[PDB]
């Protein structure tokens, strides 16, 4: 029988007004015998009718996949509204329903701290610039490193880790050639999170 | 979720913890875990092999009923430090009546060149000194394989108010992580010396420490 997964928008889409966040209902294991699928969408139980449902696509195991996509208002998602995908199929005695929303709980603002490389690291050709982001809830967050108004490529960020007070934390490591560091170039760790003013802050680091 | 649908047992085979393998005093175990075992058929049978030779030293623990009816069943095989670190292979064969055939899983040490971790302790940001508790960071990078243990201490005593990130794959194919120890600012300001302890197979004596203080 059909299976339904429901996917949330990307944090960067919800945190920036000029972008379009979307919720995505994906149905799989749709039969050749019953290929036809109907989507109803609700926002806090209020049905809405502007979802874009895509034509079904047979997968390489002879089963169909049907995707329906609902654009969401930023404020609605951030105010914790519930988004419900109801999936009707002749092979379903009752419609499948999945619901999602933002993580519930008192949102908490991240604290952002940039840490220079350890003196011990200075004897190598590349150094580590560290951005610690802690005390934030929910775990959804986007962290980016940039320099001279441009993104940096050689950085990796740990996934969020549940800290002892129920908030989350992570670290982002930027690797740069030591010479760029010694020369006094300025680096910035940018953070986006719902509980920040304007959903945004940045901290800078340099010698 | 008190009733029970299904489609055969599921087996996961876990390696010994880094700390048990890197210290001769401790006891490294390989653990074979079986979930989705049916109430109708709770009997599970394990066979263990080391490079194909059957061994009999394993100890299976009593079944564990989960919130669904399904049982969980665990078998634990203690391994020799040398065997694991020299790359001997451990097979767990799981037998059950809901299975059309025995499930086999194998595990062994990561092949691929070990790389020594670099350990860097990082003091709290100036900006964090406005707060009541401060963050002491230990960056451990450039290591392979990912199996690693990081702990904190001060003055001969463990310091356990920390969290450590999972290992993250870096862009050069090695791993890194960060460990954050939270201490009262007063203890930092008092000039107490804290120490990040790292255990990994590619380290001399499988052990190194880096200290951190005001
Ligand atoms: C026939 O083939 C089908 C397709 O493929 C294949 O065959 C060939 C082609 C192969 O080459 C290969 O491609 C395929 O094998 C098969 O389809 C399957 O069916 C699976 C089983 O149901 C299903 O697994 C679920 O996977 C989700 C995760 O999904 C996402 O990840 C997978 C893996 O990477 C992706 O494939 C998939 O596309 C999903 O990815 C996300 O898609 C979103 C929508 O597009 C993206 O978001 C949007 O992106 C746009 C971008 O333009 C925009 O940004 C929008 O804003 C945004 O919304 C998103 O970016 C993308 N993310 C990523 C990372 O890629 C899992 O979550 C599920 O796990 C849950 O259920 C299982 C049991 O079913 C359970 O064991 C788990 O524990 C999970 O349970 C939940 O648990 C959590 C906590 O753990 C709880 O919180 C929940 O309460 C609990 N809920 C439930 C209900 O239990 C599933 O494992 C596959 O995803 C699906 N594949 C595809 C392509 O659709 C099919 O099986 C085959 N049929 C047969 C008979 O063989
Ligand atoms: C029916 O319900 C069962 C039970 O599920 C859970 O129980 C129910 C009632 C709810 O409360 C659930 O929320 C709850 O999770 C369920 O069984 C689970 O099945 C899934 C597959 O569907 C298994 O998932 C996989 O997970 C793999 C990774 O799993 C480990 O890490 C998780 C944390 O993320 C733990 O929760 C697990 O218990 C497990 O822990 C590991 O355990 C091993 C051995 O015990 C440890 O190794 C040993 O550690 C000691 C330290 O004391 C020494 O160092 C030894 O040397 C060493 O060998 C290991 O350290 C530890 N790891 C950690 C991080 O703690 C993942 O890789 C797979 O991809 C997959 O996602 C899931 O693990 C399993 N749960 C358990 C507890 O086994 C059924 O699926 C349900 N069935 C249905 C139909 O609903």
UniProtKB/Swiss-Prot annotation, chain A:
This is Immunoglobulin heavy constant gamma 1. Glycans are attached at residue 61. Residues 2-101, 110-206 form the Ig-like domain. Immunoglobulins are composed of two identical heavy chains and two identical light chains; disulfide-linked. Interacts with FCGR1A; this interaction mediates IgG effector functions on monocytes. Interacts with FCGR2A and FCGR3A. It comes from Homo sapiens (Human). The chain holds residues 120 to 326 of 399 of the full protein. Constant region of immunoglobulin heavy chains. Immunoglobulins, also known as antibodies, are membrane-bound or secreted glycoproteins produced by B lymphocytes. In the recognition phase of humoral immunity, the membrane-bound immunoglobulins serve as receptors which, upon binding of a specific antigen, trigger the clonal expansion and differentiation of B lymphocytes into immunoglobulins-secreting plasma cells. Secreted immunoglobulins mediate the effector phase of humoral immunity, which results in the elimination of bound antigens. One of its GO terms (biological process) is antibody-dependent cellular cytotoxicity. The gene is IGHG1. It comes from the Eukaryota.
């Amino acid at each position: 029988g059909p299976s339904v997964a429901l996917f949330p928008p990307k944090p960067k889409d919800t945190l920036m007004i000029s972008r379009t966040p979307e919720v995505t209902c994906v149905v799989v294991d749709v039969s050749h015998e019953d290929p036809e699928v109907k989507f109803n969408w609700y926002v806090d139980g209020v049905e809405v009718h502007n979802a874009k449902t895509k034509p079904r696509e047979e997968q390489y195991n002879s089963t169909y996949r049907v995707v329906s996509v609902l654009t969401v208002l930023h404020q609605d998602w951030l105010n914790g509204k519930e988004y419900k995908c109801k999936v009707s199929n002749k092979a379903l005695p009752a419609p499948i329903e999945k619901t999602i929303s933002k993580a519930k709980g008192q949102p908490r603002e991240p604290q952002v701290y940039t840490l220079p490389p350890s003196r011990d690291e200075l004897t190598k050709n590349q150094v580590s610039l560290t951005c610690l982001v802690k005390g934030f809830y929910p775990s959804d967050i986007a962290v980016e490193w940039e320099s001279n108004g441009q993104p940096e490529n050689n950085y990796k960020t740990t996934p969020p880790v549940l800290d002892s007070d129920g908030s989350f934390f992570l670290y982002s490591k930027l690797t740069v050639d030591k010479s760029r560091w010694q020369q006094g170039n300025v680096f910035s760790c940018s953070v986006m999170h719902e509980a920040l003013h304007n959903h945004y802050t940045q901290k800078s680091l340099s010698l």
